[PDB]
Amino acid sequence: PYVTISATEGLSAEKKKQLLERSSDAVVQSIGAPLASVRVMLHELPGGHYLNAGQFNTPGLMFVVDFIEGRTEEQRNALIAALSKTGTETTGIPESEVRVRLLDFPKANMGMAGGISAKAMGR
Amino acid sequence: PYVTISATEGLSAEKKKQLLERSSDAVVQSIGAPLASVRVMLHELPGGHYLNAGQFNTPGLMFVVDFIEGRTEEQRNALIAALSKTGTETTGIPESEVRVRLLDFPKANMGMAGGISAKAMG
Amino acid sequence: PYVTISATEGLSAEKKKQLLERSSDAVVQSIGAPLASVRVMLHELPGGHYLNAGQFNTPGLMFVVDFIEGRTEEQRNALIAALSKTGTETTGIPESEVRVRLLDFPKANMGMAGGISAKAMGR
């Protein structure tokens, strides 16, 4: 599971660490993914690089999760909710603004350690 | 709808401002999306971080749209055309080099305000 | 096709150069795509912006390939093989850590030169 986070700049180093750590925790508790398979990446949006509803310079925090298809609806809703709550508890940005997206991948398309697809592993 | 733009370094602040503003317009007018729901993000690619058909240091401008399933072909073709046109008008990079990608998300996978998906939102 | 590389900071200029050039070669050789169609983009992850299995400050190299639907499983496996191998040969990051993802696009979803889709071109 890949968690790619887009945040507007302004967070301290402490907040970044906490955001990524608790996001990883959120994935583990939501869909029961092993920690060894969880990765979080942070992309920071500089000033004027985020247009929100026609407004510049607004706080932003968006989650995108790349994962192998097959998760149940309950798992998806739990994942969206956990990451959204994590983001707000960490950054202070309300869930009304925080967004989370889920992207499905066929096992044949998800390469794994040693450079083979998840289907080849029969993951 | 999320519009994520990847552009090579070199643009002025004014053209950056122009790029995102008109990108927002392109979305509103192509698929009839409410302005309140339209977001545009910009990522700048430094020199040597963009390889174009074997060549480094060439101008780059690529659009990626993340949005919910259900749009007609006409809407989708219009969105691609409008973003391509917008990109050329604001940066000077010809539509021959400009690129637009679309991502369909099922309502079950697209989170909304309040940490709930579009499907659960009903 | 689009090859978007996410890599932790630390690579020299010449290694970044080889990585992009050989990732392009990997695409051309694996799926037989013309050189004129291959694009490679590099996103560099600063310190503390990549969490790997609960640990910060680890080397990271992740490939995401955005491309049109229709490629065979044979090509997909070969592409994942070529990029993973390229990633290690260039950066020195072992294939056990290197990751390659493949993302299918409907022909109507892939904009081409001139602001029309691949489907509109007749592909």
Resolution (A): 2.0
Q: In what order do the strands lie in the sheet with C61-68?
A: B50-52, C39-45, C2-8, C61-68, C99-105
Chain A residues with CB-CB distance to C60 below 8 A: 39, 41
Is A46 at the interface with chain C, CB within 8 A?
Answer: no
Distances B67 to B35, B118, C25 between C-alpha atoms, Å: 14, 11, 32
Q: Which residue's entry shows tokens 């507007």? A: A8
Please name the residue of chain A whose CA is at the shortest distance from the CA of residue B40.
A51
Spatial CB neighbours of C74, under 8 Å, sequence gap ≥ 6: none
Distance CA C48, CA C55 (A): 10
Cross-chain residue pair C110–B104, CB shorter than 8 Å: no
Q: How many CB pairs under 8 A join A and B?
A: 92
Q: Look at A51 and B13 and tell me if their CB atoms are within 8 Å.
A: no
Q: Give me the residues paired with residue A5 across strands.
A: A42, A63
The alpha carbon of B115 is separated from its chain's Cα centroid by a whole number of angstroms, namely: 23
- CB C73 within 8 Å of CB C31: no
Rg (CA), chain B: 15
Yes or no: say if C66 and C27 are a contact pair by the CB < 8 Å rule. Answer: no
Report the C-alpha gap between C118 and C111 in whole angstroms: 6
Q: How close, in Å, is residue C79 to chain A by CA atoms?
A: 10
Asked if A103 is an interface residue toward chain B (Cβ–Cβ < 8 A), one would say yes
Contact B42 A43 (CB under 8 A): no
Contact assignment for C114 to B95 by CB distance below 8 Å: yes
Owning domain of residue B85: 1-122
- Asked if B85 lies within 8 A of C115 by C-beta distance, the reply is yes
* Residues C99, B121: Cα–Cα separation, whole Å: 35
Q: How far apart are CA A110 and CA A113, in angstroms?
A: 10
Q: How many C-beta neighbours within 10 Å does residue A6 have?
A: 22
- Cβ–Cβ < 8 Å for A75, B108: no
- Give contacts of A117 with chain C, Cβ < 8 Å: 76-77, 80
Residue C36: closest C-alpha in chain B? B53
Chain A hits for C100, CB-CB cut-off 8 Å, are 111, 115
Structural domain count, chain C = 1
Torsion angles phi and psi, residue C44, rounded to 5? -100, 125
Spatial CA neighbour of C64 closest among B81, A111, B113, A49:
A111
Using a CB–CB cutoff of 8 Å, tell me whether C46 touches chain B: no
